[PDB]
């Protein structure tokens, strides 16, 4: 059957209004007068009046401009009626299609798109994705076919176009060998969305790309040699301070330094990292001994809290200071068993104290004796005499105190000496 085609009317028409669209006719109009009417959304129901018809001729007219982005299609029904009002035809369906016009520029979902990329990323690494929309007819025209391009890149010093965008999906990928955060941390790009496959209405947006910092720069000691002095028997005493410089992103694990002393088997030294200065504070862990080793050549290797994605090892000399030390009796608690048959002048023992300082003349003396019946020789330390007594010593063993000053530290030593005579 020959039928009426779809009636096309372009959107955004300028006039003159009303404008004819198409004429309809009932072949019964030779038998009598036929009057034509139209109904439907756009005619007698909202939006009322957009389409009218001339009742005596049959011309379908449009009375105002149209917007395909608001109503893309209208469906009307035309009616044929005699003088008395009786219908002489069946209601004929009429389709009005609003021909699209490229009257909508593409719009990005936001003005500033943010993204991130790893340091030295290989070409083809998807960094971020920008998306834009277009309200025009994406079915019958290319008025909504968006093509994404890159316009600007700031900076453009490593390469004029380090990134590349996709025309269709609009993803931004790396296209060069890579960049460092230490050279250029931020890249600003100006992306453009244009309809008609790029040859139509345009719209720009900003895409900021930050370079993620890796650990591609090792910590380097500013002075490679150090020197310091500390006393002999002293712990947690500052010896020196190490100075390092790390080019990575500060206050991050790739910048925080961790110092490990390599040649310290006994663990006599410990280096703590000051988080503000990123400096190594070297203090003695345990107490040092001058007579054991007079000079230490410590090697300190600096690393980071995060593993590397050439480690600098420093040299620091530690000079121990000679400190005087009290003579230690051998043993500190001298015990010698004896009976009460000991003579009034016989020598009981000889408590010899050793002098720790290898640099000095020891003289022995009696510090405290309850019975005052003990005599000492200052040259050789020979203890000589000068169990019924309960007030002098209630315990079964009399306790003696022996001191030994040197040429000045005193120190202290003990002597314990282990019958029914009464």
């Amino acid at each position, epitope marked *: 059957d020959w039928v009426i085609p779809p009636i096309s009317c372009p959107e955004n028409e*300028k*006039g*003159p*209004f009303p404008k004819n669209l198409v004429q309809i006719k009932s072949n019964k109009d030779k038998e009598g007068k036929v009057f034509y009417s139209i109904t439907g959304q756009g005619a007698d129901t909202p*939006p009322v*009046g*957009v389409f009218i018809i001339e009742r005596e001729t049959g011309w379908l007219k449009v009375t*105002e401009p*149209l917007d395909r982005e608001r109503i893309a299609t209208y469906t009307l029904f035309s009616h044929a009626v005699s003088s008395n009002g009786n219908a002489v035809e069946d209601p004929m369906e009429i389709l009005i299609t609003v021909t699209d016009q490229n009257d909508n520029k593409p719009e990005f979902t936001q003005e500033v798109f943010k993204g991130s990329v790893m340091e030295g990323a290989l070409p083809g690494t998807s960094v971020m994705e920008v998306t834009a929309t277009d309200a025009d007819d994406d079915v019958n025209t290319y008025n909504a076919a968006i093509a994404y391009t890159i316009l600007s890149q700031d900076p453009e010093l490593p390469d004029k176009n380090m990134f590349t965008i996709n025309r269709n999906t609009g993803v931004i990928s790396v296209v060069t060998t890579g960049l460092d955060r230490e050279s250029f941390p931020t890249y600003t790009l100006v992306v453009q969305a244009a309809d008609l496959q790029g040859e139509g209405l345009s719209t720009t947006a900003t895409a900021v790309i930050t370079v993620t910092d890796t650990n591609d720069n090792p910590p380097i000691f500013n002075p490679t040699t150090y020197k310091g002095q500390v006393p002999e028997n002293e712990a947690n005493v500052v010896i020196t301070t190490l100075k390092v410089t790390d080019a990575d992103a500060p206050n991050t694990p790739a910048w925080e330094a961790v110092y490990t002393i390599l040649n310290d088997d006994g663990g006599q030294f410990v280096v703590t990292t000051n988080p503000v200065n990123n400096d190594g504070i070297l203090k003695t862990a345990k107490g040092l001994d001058f007579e054991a080793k007079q000079q230490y050549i410590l090697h300190v290797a600096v690393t980071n809290v995060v593993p590397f994605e050439t480690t600098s090892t420093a040299t620091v000399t530690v000079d121990v200071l000679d400190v005087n030390e009290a003579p230690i009796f051998v043993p500190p608690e001298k015990r010698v068993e004896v009976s009460e048959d000991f003579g009034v002048g016989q020598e009981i023992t000889s408590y010899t104290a050793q002098e720790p300082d290898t640099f000095q003349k020891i003289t022995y003396r009696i510090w405290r004796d309850t019975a005052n019946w003990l005599e000492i020789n200052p040259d050789t330390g020979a203890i000589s005499t000068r169990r019924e007594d309960f007030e002098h010593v209630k315990n079964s063993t009399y306790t003696a105190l022996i001191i030994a000053t040197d040429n000045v530290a005193t120190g202290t030593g003990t002597l314990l000496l282990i019958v029914n005579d009464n």
Partner: antibody
Amino acid sequence: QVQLKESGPGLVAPSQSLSITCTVSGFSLSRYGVHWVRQPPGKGLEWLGMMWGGGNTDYNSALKSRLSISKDNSKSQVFLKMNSLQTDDTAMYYCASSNYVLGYAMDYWGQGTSVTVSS
Amino acid sequence: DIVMTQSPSSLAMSVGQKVTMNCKSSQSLLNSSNQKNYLAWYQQKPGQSPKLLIYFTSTRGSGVPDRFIGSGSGTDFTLTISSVEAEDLADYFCQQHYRTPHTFGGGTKVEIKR
């Protein structure tokens, strides 16, 4: 009785934005086209734009980039907005009604509002 | 845009004389759907809003006396005041309402000689 009345600021500083409201009565805003016409002091009439009933808008070619016309059928109001105002924008601003039976000629005009662009 | 050229810019007639204003359009204003030229004339008496005097080239608006005659076709249009009265002093503007943007003429100022 078709009636239109313009309302807006009398004085607005240069480089600012202007917003004029056209309050109508006696007809349905969705069936009529409402125009904006302005007239600078001692000069002729100047067509600014119009808002059709369906919601389409057309603007003066020279001023299109600075103009914006909207409306609210429910409140029976048509709005004109002008950005980046210049002193030569000082004029009497009219709104007028029209419909397709007269080819959208302007058969009912408002009294006009005075807009002076000056610091 | 369609350019409306109005001549003369000013006229001075005594009461009873015939006033003739001309308006030239850059292109045709004929709507093939209704065979009407979309040409309008507006009257702006001093201190008043414009008034729709003529539309569709020759159809008079409401409350317009018979002495105002709109004529013309093609691209040449004319507004005639057959016998001008003293109250008729005003600015007269021709306007095409054919295609948006609608455009006005420069206007013809009518003054009364006495």
